Structure 1
Amino acid sequence: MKPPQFTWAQWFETQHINMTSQQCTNAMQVINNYQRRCKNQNTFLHTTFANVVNVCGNPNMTCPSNKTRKNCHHSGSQVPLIHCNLTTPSPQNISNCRYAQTPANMFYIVACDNRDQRRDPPQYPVVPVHLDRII
């Protein structure tokens, strides 16, 4: 579930790469204001989009979240990350949603696909499209 102006890769970047504040309540405003709902949980990876693209080059493996998909890739190394958990739902005023933040250093598994032909930049033929799991 993403706003229509973003490709899957651009939405992946918005949700998981471009944390706009180190504090979850503030950073989550971006995701929530775009998807018109307070997301119950979300992981921000302190890594770069280029680094994730390179993870897409690691061997294909089964996606933990969907046993039938084989477009997943393991990060190889751990990264610092911040996991945000909703503490104070507010469906009629999403700016009032508050979150806890949990820091960790973990591996991740990402699903990757070929880029959106019309809208993703040709620089990256293969892009991350979903954060499948953190381990």
Structure 2
Amino acid sequence: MKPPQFTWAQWFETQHINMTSQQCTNAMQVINNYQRRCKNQNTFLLTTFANVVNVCGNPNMTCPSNKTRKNCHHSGSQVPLIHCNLTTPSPQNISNCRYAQTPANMFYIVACDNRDQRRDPPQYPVVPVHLDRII
């Protein structure tokens, strides 16, 4: 889920672009402390927000993860990524969740939408709002 203070684009950035530490256990604390639960799996794309916004400009395609959606876009270029996997689930205390990290270079498919009119900066009319898939 998404904390109230973030727009979908801001939450996308927090979850898949701003890896605050090259270590998943530490990087995931940010996401988990925000959504009050240890996310089982999360991919951090080693790319820039602007790079992803531009991928939103690639042709529209069906979202592999939600076949009814056509707001997805394929990167057209593989990128380095770190995939975090929960190794130590801790529902009674989320700061004790540990993760494994798996490096890879793959393509990414992102769902994009028009920006949150009120909260998203006007600089980017179109923004990524969901990481639909890594292929």
TM over 0.5: yes
Pick the TM interval, shorter chain.
over 0.9
Residue 106 of structure 1: how far off its partner (Å)? 0.2
Give percent identity, aligned residues only.
Answer: 99
In 2, Cα distance between the equivalents of 1:40 and 1:110?
19
Instruction: Give per-residue Cα distances to partners, 1:74-120, cap 9 Å, x unaligned.
Output: 00000000000000011111110000000000000000000000000
State the TM-score, normalized to the length of structure 2: 0.99
TM-score (structure 1 length as normaliser): 0.99
> Residues of 2 paired with 1:41 and 1:68: CA distance?
23
CA distance in 1, matches of 2:40, 2:51: 26
Unaligned runs of 5+ in 1: none
Q: C-alpha root-mean-square deviation of aligned residues, in Å?
A: 0.3
Runs of 4+ in 1 over 6 A off after TM superposition: none
Encode CA deviations 1:63-84: one digit per residue, 9 max, x unaligned: 0011111000000000000000
> Could you tell me how far apart the structure 1 residues matched to 2:118 and 2:81 are?
31
Secondary structure of the equivalent of 1:132?
strand
What does residue 92 of structure 2 align with?
A: 92
Q: Which consecutive residues of structure 2, in runs of 5 or more, have no partner in the other structure? A: none
**CA distance in 2 between partners of 1:6 and 1:21 (Å):** 21
In the alignment of these two chains, the number of paired residues is: 135
> Alpha-carbon deviation of 1:13?
0.1
Task: Provide the C-alpha distance between the structure 2 equivalents of 1:61 and 1:88, rounded to a whole number of angstroms.
Answer: 36
Instruction: Write the deviation string for residues 26-64 of structure 1: whole angstroms up to 9, x where unpaired.
Output: 000000000000000000000000000000000000000
